Design a protein around this ligand. Structure first.
Ligand code: CLA
Ligand code: CLA
Ligand code: CLA
Ligand code: CLA
Ligand code: CLA
Ligand code: CLA
Ligand code: CLA
Ligand code: CLA
Ligand code: CLA
Ligand SMILES: CC1=C(/C=C/C(C)=C/C=C/C(C)=C/C=C/C=C(C)/C=C/C=C(C)/C=C/C2=C(C)CCCC2(C)C)C(C)(C)CCC1
Ligand code: SF4
Lengths: 82, 80, 38, 82, 141, 39, 68, 30, 737
């Protein structure tokens, strides 16, 4: 049972890194708007190439930068998420 | 080696000996109990310290009591 | 990079001594101390 | 989807109206949680993908969702009886 | 005298906020009712009502009335719980109706639990509220 | 007869009590909202 | 005064029911150290972890008791 | 600023608690 | 048959790796050493004291030597408000060009570290002017450390080893510690202040050459013996005085204004000297209290035994036997003395932290904001350490030094007699603070999130504001006892009042800050933290000897893993659980109060105090406007576009996160999983070719249960201090730097 107890922490760690990789790679390199010229302006700006190689880049450009919406959500329609 | 000490509040139910996994405990005759027997720990150098004997003791506080002391290669239970 | 302070060559000697040399000496000596029998 | 959603509004303009299928009762200041999502509907912007699933299923009106909800209740009672 | 705390009507930061008070209920003028109801409080420089807790009157509504109301309700809950717990002791099967609550006894405990401070004073002066230190289990030192 | 004993259990009664208390508080804050203090 | 069914208070400090009152199940007349079997309403801590059961009786001596 | 010789003077002064710390540590061992 | 550890033979025959780990951790527990008597115990402790004082003096000597050698003390005294103090130089083989360019700061030509301990302000205030005065101080501290080392070596020699009666001579030790350690040292510091620090603040260099020639007052030692002491307070320093130079300077060496210096924003050095002379006189007088050799004095045992309220007293015999059995209990037990010492030291360290920020005593240290932040946080964390250690040693005293026969029905026995009434009421007050502090925070969070911040429960702290107004603050309009000028206290002969009143009623200092509804809730969080940490600590100290689940807890000692899975489960029942579970609560409380201090002072120093005053009432304002907002320049210390001077602080931030999260591994995962893992690793080593030649002498086992609780605790602690020190220093140095 206690190996399941520890494996729950490790699946938390594993799947958290999986969904963090997804939520950064798609926002930086897939999702975004299309300019009328034809180029794609992504949500973050393609910072996965240079910031997803460092833990400080994952802390700064993903966790600190993208949680600016969840902490400024108070007094708005997404305040239940904050 | 651990110290397995058996006190005189023992009812001689033999649960500690059957609960012991390394044959540390046994029953000796004793005139001070209704069951006529008390637990003894002769080969207490084989005690790992699992306290299964302390788990199985039905006294209000345990008549058999394990004191974890010096650690040997048998107290650690090491196959290597 | 050497400093403008007096005896700037002493960080170039003491820092590798205290960071590499004497910790290796202390771990070797303490290893021989804690692993010797009798 | 049948009663508390803007699915009929979402089917007309699916590129500028957000999917919403849950309204929030105004007893305390949680009426702010009803997001402005389009078509004169206020509610929580759902992300379950039920609306796109019903569009791929060919569901065009909310009565077809009401019939499926009634059928789900009948099937749940049938499973309880089984 | 709290000169740093101005009344919310005289405070020029509360009146800027009080236009944009959101409605909480389905009542359309709920923001205006909150704005007029919070004007009797004291507002700081932020423009938000403050509560002064020192038992003074004209500010007893901040703490003294809600505090006494909670003390009555919490004493009700605790006294009905203690009365039910005492009543289910001396009838030889106490764990089963500790786990499966005897409703007809609990209703009679609850609806007669309004007179909790009178019964509390009676049990305090009678000595049947507090168990003596001899007749009570104490852990070893 | 055995159903009333199940309804007299601790989780069913604590759920009924908490739903009744939450409903009383919600119905009070609907009809009389925004009571930060006693006037 | 110690007889079967008499309610009696424990004077063992280390016991779970120190200064608590339990009934007497049996008293042994042979020469043993703890002849008075006393049964309690509450249960002891004894048992494995997660066990919902525990012992509620123990042998005690004459000087370890007082009759109420 | 201090001179270059003052650093070496302070180092050979620091050998006097250097030796005495070694002498105290061995006697604290005993 | 292994020589390590020498002091324990039970661990010497241990064939596993637990022998080394437990020989490290039982090295300083001299009481459990094999063949240890009390007479040898006290002498080994006495020599370890000298070794520790020598370590302190060598650390101080290194600090002053690095200020003198590779710091900038010449440049800093010219512009203390603009020049950054340099701690020491950096010699790193790992630096690239970006780090050398980034760490070449504070006017240096080398990679240097900026000092945040603020000893530059201390040295400038006490009379240091050039680097040579620091170098001679460093050399003198080296000689003092060598002297302490030789004293410690000497007191281990059998000729000079003190007897047991000398160590337990409490009366003489108290007399020489109050008269000499506290009174003579404060009198000597007064001598330094009136001889060096006060004239160097007035531009008059003294040094060791001219202190026998420069007379501290124009009337030197003549008003001292006649009695007209007012001559030393006739010409105080003008408010237009400039520090370190002679214009605007006075001549009085003992002034008593009680205010702040208008330039340095600190207390007057003449005020400091007068305070030190007063407390030196009081400490010398208090040192003449206990009888040693000359008949007159006091004996502590008679004072303790005479202090019990008799019959007919309105309290009666409520204390039982009173204090008889003390002075044997305290003097025999070293853990009682250690706990009392650590409690007193933790309280006075808390006082140091709470007083050096509101009443700075060092020149231009109020305007060096990062020094204030580092000093407050550094002293409060150490105060929490000392206080938790005080309670831990109280627990150790109960488990291995408490005698119920000697302490029979005294105050100490009657503490244990109702030992869990205290625990139940402390649990009640912990829940009473916790439920309602979290309830008001969550209520404020929900109503601010719901667009209605006016529905917050904002509570003005009127009691502490009444205290502020009673100390002389006219902002709240209480008009109480110093706020009005017509009170009996205000109309007295209190001549500190003209300085104190305009020091407290000016908002340019940290003296008696404006407190509002965001200060009430954090203070109740602080009260919750102290009450709960006290609950774990009192709960484990009083249940140290034993209790209902484990009666014989004293037989296994202070620190044991468990007592098996029997009796329902017995994890964390040793009195070491109090220390282990209260390090977390102490660190949480110190985090709460240091976040409070840092955010309030960031609002003060930035000049926008409204941010704290409206956003600290709910926890999302704490989470956003303090953590997220002030971590911005921290985490951008190194980015893909370059390297700042805060790159080492971002690296320490991540390092503290890594160590803190590595602690979770030892605290959550427990031993037998790792023992089962190491058994497979042992099989893999012994069965592979070419590596089974290398055989271990000791059998690799998992870390034991208490050892891993300690290792996870140490990781949690080291990560906690490292990541908060990094965040604090970078947050208030990227702005005010
Ligand atoms: C404990 C006090 C303390 C501390 C923390 C530091 C720390 C530092 N010193 Mg040192 N130092 C000190 C005392 C101190 N020093 C004193 C008293 C002197 C003699 C006057 C100096 C002389 C000095 C020189 C000349 C140099 C440093 C340098 C260094 C740096 C790297 C260490 C090194 O290689 O040199 C250590 C070399 C020594 C000669 C120090 C000897 C040991 C001292 C005397 C104290 C003993 C330490 C401690 C008390 C014992 C171990 C405790 C243990 C529990 C950890 C580092 C910033 C280097 C530097 O600036 O690089 C940029 C450098 O070259 N130091
Ligand atoms: C805790 C349980 C849980 C919850 C609450 C949901 C909830 C959700 N799922 Mg999900 N799901 C889960 C577990 C869960 N699922 C599991 C365990 C599986 C694996 C079988 C899936 C696979 C699944 C798929 C494939 C899809 C959903 C989708 C949905 C969303 C809309 C629900 C709906 O009507 O889809 C209705 C969707 C379908 C009827 C298509 C499913 C048909 C699959 C391919 C056949 C499965 C047959 C059989 C049950 C499985 C046999 C396994 C085989 C190896 C033997 C919603 C967010 C849909 C979605 O994201 O839409 C936006 C979607 O397409 N889920
Ligand atoms: C009859 C019920 C009852 C009564 C009157 C008491 C009264 C007492 N408890 Mg509490 N308590 C109870 C139940 C009760 N409690 C239960 C159910 C729990 C488990 C959650 C606890 C756990 C507990 C803790 C952990 C602490 C107290 C404390 C205290 C004291 C201060 C009050 C307080 O802190 O409230 C706190 C109350 C709670 C945390 C939970 C109370 C839950 C409800 C309100 C109890 C009443 C409802 C009950 C379940 C059903 C009623 C019966 C009904 C069928 C008629 C006081 C002696 C403190 C103490 O020792 O101070 C001296 C202490 O530290 N109690
Ligand atoms: C534990 C601390 C605590 C405190 C002191 C309060 C106190 C308050 N809250 Mg609350 N709140 C809290 C935590 C707490 N809350 C938490 C945990 C949440 C998040 C879920 C909230 C979220 C919240 C919101 C969103 C609202 C409040 C409001 C209220 C206010 C009145 C509620 C009401 O109906 O009164 C009136 C009740 C009575 C008069 C009782 C009558 C019936 C009794 C039981 C019978 C009496 C018989 C005699 C009051 C200031 C409301 C308010 O007005 O805001 C200011 C409001 O809208 N709270
Ligand atoms: C007057 C003579 C005298 C004096 C000066 C000392 C001095 C001392 N003794 Mg000693 N003692 C004496 C005689 C004396 N004793 C007598 C006769 C007895 C025999 C009965 C003892 C027996 C004895 C024992 C048994 C022990 C001591 C110890 C010590 C040391 C205490 C620890 C220390 O250094 O803290 C010094 C701390 C201070 C000066 C400050 C104390 C805290 C202050 C008051 C709080 C405020 C600080 C203030 C704000 C300043 C801040 C500093 C600045 C950076 C801002 C110290 C060196 C211990 C030892 O061995 O140490 C080596 C110890 O084991 N002594
Ligand atoms: C224990 C601390 C201490 C010590 C060692 C000294 C030492 C001394 N003081 Mg003193 N001083 C101190 C405390 C101290 N002071 C305090 C507490 C005050 C404030 C009341 C003064 C105020 C004071 C004055 C006003 C003068 C001295 C002077 C002297 C010197 C007299 C001896 C001589 O040869 O001439 C000598 C250097 C005299 C001096 O410097 O003349 C050379 C001088 O006139 N002192
Ligand atoms: C004036 C300070 C003071 C002094 C004299 C001591 C003295 C003592 N403590 Mg300690 N203690 C204190 C403060 C104090 N403590 C504080 C501040 C804490 C709270 C954090 C505690 C918490 C504490 C506990 C709860 C225990 C003691 C115990 C010990 C004893 C042996 C030390 C040990 O385990 O070996 C030395 C310890 C180690 C080598 C462990 C590593 C410690 C850190 C991680 C190393 C840091 C080194 C660093 C590089 C410099 C000894 C009597 C132990 C005991 O029961 O003895 C009776 C023990 O279990 N202490
Ligand atoms: C945010 C995390 C958190 C929270 C809220 C708790 C909560 C509490 N801890 Mg703590 N604690 C924590 C983390 C936390 N702790 C961690 C990390 C450790 C370190 C190992 C401990 C270890 C610790 C010890 C060892 C002790 C506590 C104690 C307690 C109580 C303190 C009394 C109090 O604050 O009022 C109560 C406050 C609360 C917030 C109670 C929770 C009520 C929730 C919010 C209601 C939810 C209702 C919802 C509808 C479902 C309380 C139950 C002490 C205790 O229980 O003594 C009485 C105790 O001795 N804790
Ligand atoms: C037992 C809980 C508890 C504890 C530990 C404290 C702790 C604290 N309070 Mg206090 N306080 C509390 C309850 C408590 N409070 C309550 C119930 C009220 C009324 C709402 C206040 C209102 C109050 C104000 C207005 C202020 C403090 C402040 C402070 C600090 C200074 C000490 C002081 O003035 O004590 C005051 C002590 C009491 C009022 C005793 C309360 C204990 C009783 C038994 C509670 C039950 C009474 C019941 C509700 C009626 C300190 C951190 C000051 C602060 O925040 O500093 C910035 C401040 O000025 N308190
Ligand atoms: C177990 C034990 C222990 C432990 C415990 C502890 C550790 C404790 C601590 C405690 C503490 C550490 C406490 C503290 C306290 C404090 C106090 C009690 C204070 C008071 C003060 C006052 C009262 C003040 C007053 C005033 C003035 C003077 C002026 C102004 C105003 C005022 C009011 C503020 C010991 C060691 C003993 C021993 C063994 C046993
Ligand atoms: S501790 Fe385990 S091995 Fe030792 S006597 Fe008890 S049951 Fe047997």
């Amino acid at each position: 049972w206690d190996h399941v107890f520890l494996g729950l922490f490790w699946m938390y760690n594993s799947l958290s890194i999986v969904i963090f990789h997804f939520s950064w790679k798609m926002q930086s390199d897939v999702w975004g708007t299309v300019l009328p010229d034809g180029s794609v302006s992504h949500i973050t700006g393609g910072n996965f190439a240079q910031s997803a190689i460092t833990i400080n880049g994952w802390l700064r450009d993903f966790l600190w930068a993208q949680a600016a919406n969840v902490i400024n959500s108070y007094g708005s329609a997404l305040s239940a998420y904050g | 080696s651990h110290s397995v000490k058996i006190y005189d509040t023992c009812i001689g139910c033999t649960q500690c000996v059957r609960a012991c996994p390394l044959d540390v405990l046994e029953m000796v005759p004793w005139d001070g109990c209704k069951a006529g027997q008390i637990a003894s720990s002769p080969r207490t150098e084989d005690c790992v310290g699992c306290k299964r004997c302390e788990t199985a003791c039905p006294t209000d506080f345990l008549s058999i009591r394990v004191y974890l002391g010096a650690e040997t290669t048998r107290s650690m239970g090491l196959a290597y | 990079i050497l400093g403008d302070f007096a005896a700037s060559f002493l960080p170039a000697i003491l820092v590798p001594a205290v960071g590499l040399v004497m910790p290796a000496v202390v771990m070797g000596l303490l290893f021989l101390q804690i692993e010797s029998e009798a | 989807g049948a009663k508390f959603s803007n699915y009929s509004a979402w089917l007309a303009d699916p590129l500028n109206i957000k999917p919403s299928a849950q309204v929030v009762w105004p007893v305390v200041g949680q009426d702010i949680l009803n997001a402005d999502v389009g078509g004169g509907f206020h509610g929580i912007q759902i992300t379950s993908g039920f609306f796109q699933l019903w569009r791929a299923s060919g569901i065009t009106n909310e009565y077809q969702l009401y019939c499926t909800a009634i059928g789900g209740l009948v099937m749940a009672g049938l499973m309880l009886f089984a | 005298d709290l000169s740093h705390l101005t009344p919310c009507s005289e405070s020029p930061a509360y009146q800027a906020k009080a236009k944009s008070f959101r409605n909480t209920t389905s009542d359309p003028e709920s923001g205006q009712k909150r704005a007029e109801s919070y004007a009797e409080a004291l507002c700081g420089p932020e423009g938000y009502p403050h509560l002064v807790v020192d038992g003074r009157l004209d500010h007893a509504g901040d703490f003294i009335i809600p505090g006494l109301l909670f003390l009555y309700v919490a004493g009700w809950i605790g006294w009905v719980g203690r009365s039910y717990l005492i009543a289910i002791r001396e009838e030889k099967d106490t764990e089963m109706k500790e786990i499966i609550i005897d409703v007809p006894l609990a209703i009679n405990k609850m609806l007669f639990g309004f007179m909790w401070p009178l019964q509390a004073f009676g049990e305090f002066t009678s000595g049947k509220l507090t168990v003596k230190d001899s007749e009570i289990p104490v852990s070893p030192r | 007869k055995g159903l009333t004993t199940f309804l007299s259990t601790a989780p069913v009664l604590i759920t009924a009590l908490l739903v009744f208390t939450a409903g009383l508080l919600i119905e009070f804050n609907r009809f009389y909202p925004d009571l930060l203090f006693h006037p | 005064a110690i007889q079967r069914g008499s309610k009696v208070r424990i004077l063992r400090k280390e016991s779970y029911w120190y200064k608590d009152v339990g009934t007497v199940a049996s008293v042994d007349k042979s020469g043993i150290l703890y002849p008075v079997i006393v049964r309690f309403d509450k249960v002891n801590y004894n048992g494995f972890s997660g066990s919902a059961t525990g012992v509620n009786t123990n042998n005690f001596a004459e000087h370890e008791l007082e009759e109420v | 600023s201090i001179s270059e010789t003052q650093v070496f003077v302070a180092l050979v002064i620091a050998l006097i608690p250097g030796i005495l710390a070694f002498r105290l540590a061995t006697e604290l061992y005993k | 048959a292994t020589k390590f550890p020498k002091f324990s033979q039970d661990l010497a025959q241990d064939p596993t790796t637990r022998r080394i780990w437990y020989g490290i951790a039982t090295a300083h527990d001299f009481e459990t050493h094999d063949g240890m008597t009390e007479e040898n115990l006290y002498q080994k402790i006495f020599a370890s004291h000298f070794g520790h004082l020598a370590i302190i003096f060598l650390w101080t000597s290194g600090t002053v030597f690095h200020v003198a050698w590779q710091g900038n003390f010449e440049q800093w005294i010219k512009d203390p408000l603009n020049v950054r103090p340099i701690a020491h130089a950096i010699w790193d083989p790992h630096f690239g060009q970006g780090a050398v360019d980034a760490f070449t700061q504070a006017g240096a030509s080398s990679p240097v570290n900026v000092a945040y301990s603020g000893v530059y302000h201390w040295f400038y205030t006490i009379g240091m002017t050039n680097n040579q005065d620091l170098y001679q101080g460093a050399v003198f501290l080296l000689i003092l450390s060598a002297l302490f080392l030789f004293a410690g070596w000497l007191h281990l020699q059998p000729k000079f080893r003190p007897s047991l009666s000398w160590f337990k001579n409490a009366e003489s030790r108290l007399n020489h510690h109050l008269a000499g350690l506290f009174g003579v040292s404060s009198l000597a510091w007064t001598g330094h202040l009136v001889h060096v620090a006060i004239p160097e603040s007035r531009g008059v260099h003294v040094g060791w050459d001219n202190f026998l020639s420069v007379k501290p007052h124009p009337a030197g030692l003549a008003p001292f013996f006649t009695g007209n002491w007012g001559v030393y307070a006739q010409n105080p320093d003008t408010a237009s005085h400039v520090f370190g130079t002679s214009e605007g300077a006075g001549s009085a060496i003992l002034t008593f204004l009680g205010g702040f210096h208008p330039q340095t924003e600190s207390l007057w050095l003449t005020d400091i000297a007068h305070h030190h002379l007063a407390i030196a006189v009081i400490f010398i007088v208090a040192g003449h209290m206990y009888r040693t050799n000359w008949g007159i004095g006091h004996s502590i045992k008679d004072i303790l035994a005479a202090h019990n309220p008799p019959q007919g007293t309105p309290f009666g015999g409520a204390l039982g036997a009173g204090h008889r059995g003390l002075y044997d209990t305290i003097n025999n037990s070293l853990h009682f003395q250690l706990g009392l010492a650590l409690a007193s030291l933790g309280v006075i360290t808390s006082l140091v932290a709470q007083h050096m920020y509101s009443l700075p005593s060092y020149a231009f240290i109020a305007k060096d904001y990062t020094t204030q932040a580092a000093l407050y946080t550094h002293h409060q964390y150490i105060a929490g350490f000392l206080m938790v250690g005080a309670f831990a040693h109280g627990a150790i005293f109960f488990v291995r030094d408490y005698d119920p026969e000697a302490n029979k029905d005294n105050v100490l026995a009657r503490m244990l007699e109702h030992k869990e009434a205290i625990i139940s009421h402390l649990s009640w007050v912990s829940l009473f603070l916790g439920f309602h502090t979290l309830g008001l925070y969550v209520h404020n969070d929900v109503v601010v999130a719901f667009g209605t911040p006016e529905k917050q429960i904002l509570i003005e702290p009127v009691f502490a504001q009444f205290v502020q107004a009673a100390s002389g603050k006219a902002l709240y309009g209480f008009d109480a006892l110093l706020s009005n000028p017509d009170s009996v206290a205000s109309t007295a002969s209190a001549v500190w009042l003209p300085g104190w009143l305009d020091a407290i009623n000016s908002g340019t200092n940290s003296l008696f800050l404006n407190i509002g509804p965001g200060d009430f809730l954090v203070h109740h969080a602080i009260a919750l933290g102290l009450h709960t940490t006290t609950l774990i600590l009192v709960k484990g100290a009083l249940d140290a000897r034993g209790s209902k689940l484990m009666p014989d807890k004293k037989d296994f000692g202070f620190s044991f893993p468990c007592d098996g899975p029997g009796r329902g489960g017995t994890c964390d029942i040793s009195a070491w659980d109090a220390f282990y579970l209260a390090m977390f609560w102490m660190l949480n409380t110190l985090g709460w109060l240091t976040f409070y201090w840092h955010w309030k002072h960031l609002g003060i120093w930035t000049g926008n105090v409204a941010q704290f005053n409206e956003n600290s009432t709910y926890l999302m304002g704490w989470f956003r406007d303090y953590l997220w907002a002030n971590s911005a320049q921290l985490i951008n210390g190194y980015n893909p576009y370059g390297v700042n001077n805060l790159s080492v602080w971002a690296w320490m931030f991540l390092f503290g996160h890594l160590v803190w999260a590595t602690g979770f591994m030892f605290l959550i995962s427990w031993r037998g999983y790792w023992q089962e893992l190491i058994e497979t690793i042992v099989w893999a080593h012994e069965r592979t070719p070419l590596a089974n030649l290398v055989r271990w002498k000791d059998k690799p086992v998992a870390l034991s249960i208490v050892q891993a609780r300690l290792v996870g605790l140490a990781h949690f602690t080291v990560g906690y201090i490292l990541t908060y020190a990094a965040f604090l220093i970078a947050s208030t140095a990227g702005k005010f730097g």
